[PDB]
Amino acid sequence: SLIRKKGFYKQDVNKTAWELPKTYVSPTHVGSGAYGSVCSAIDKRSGEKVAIKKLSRPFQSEIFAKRAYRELLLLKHMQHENVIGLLDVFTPASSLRNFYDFYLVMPFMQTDLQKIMGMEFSEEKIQYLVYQMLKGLKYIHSAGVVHRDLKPGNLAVNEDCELKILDFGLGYVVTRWYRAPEVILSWMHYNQTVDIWSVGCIMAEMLTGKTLFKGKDYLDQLTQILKVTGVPGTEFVQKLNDKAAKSYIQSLPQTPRKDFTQLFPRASPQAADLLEKMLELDVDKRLTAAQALTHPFFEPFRDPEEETEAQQPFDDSLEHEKLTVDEWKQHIYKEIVNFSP
């Protein structure tokens, strides 16, 4: 029996106890989150900087354990340069009795779009960033995984504006500025283009420095959205499965739509055209990621070779299962043992 597996040391990070393999040195607090915390560290085998997320009591309930397992599997499955992935995964535990937590090792990302937002970007920087976003989205979408909560805080960037999508595939009055109207209002069934709406919202915010859509409640956010999209016509209205929402729309002053040239008076024609095609209420007309990648806005950067798809769909399998915390610990433990970098 052991206290922790050999080649592990104990060190305080941000005033909590961490247990790390010897190969990871110089841990430095990065952030504390809702289900874990993150430090940066150096892999002395190569001197590369990595992020390490310590899961916080993942085995306190079945909900917590399923969540932790899902994050592990989603990170393991995706292999794309614009989608954050798994470099390593470990636990200091030597047994199931000793198994209390585990750690995920990922490439270190300096910051994210939320921290460098607020300000107006050059259209070339917007081109590069949004192109990377759409490549990552095309990949996870091709694996059958949607994000559903894409926002600037979910888009990590390093100093060279290399971008990785975070937190893919996961009440009160939480902010929903970047969520698609069909998600907020559940007035028709959604598809993968829910993320494309978010891209539009983010791109607009880069062009203007101002958040496109806010509002204290869902009705106010809808009013702000219709200011931009215009009140939709009968073709869209017929697709609503919410009869009260349909009646509400048909009873509004029928305000026409766009001149996104007028809405975004400093954007290029290609930027405004792409925004027009992403900020589209009709979920069957809104661009997919793959279609948006073909748009003239990305011509200076476009490389179809980089626009890869996942070779296999994301496949779990236990996603519907209702198991005990002990069984979830068994499966997670197996996955950690079987990992290979």
Ligand SMILES: Cc1cn(-c2cccc(C(=O)Nc3ccc(Oc4ccncc4)cc3)c2)cn1
């Ligand atoms: C609860 C849940 C989470 N997930 C999930 C799924 C897929 C990816 C991530 C994720 O990006 N996680 C992640 C993001 C940022 C992290 O922190 C950094 C900080 C700096 N550089 C790199 C990573 C660590 C983990 C999380 C599914 N269910």
